[PDB]
């Protein structure tokens, strides 16, 4: 599972950008 909210933002995106996609 799920690393999408993870490090997801932690790479090179912010809490939400990840919220739209994952």
């Known amino acids: 599972?799920?690393?999408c909210?993870?490090?997801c933002w932690?790479?090179?995106n912010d809490e939400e950008?990840?919220?739209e996609r994952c």
Do not use: D, I, S
């Open 17 to 19: 950008t990840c919220k």
């Open 10 to 12: 932690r790479e090179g």
């Open 5 to 7: 909210y993870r490090n």
């Open 1 to 3: 599972g799920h690393a």
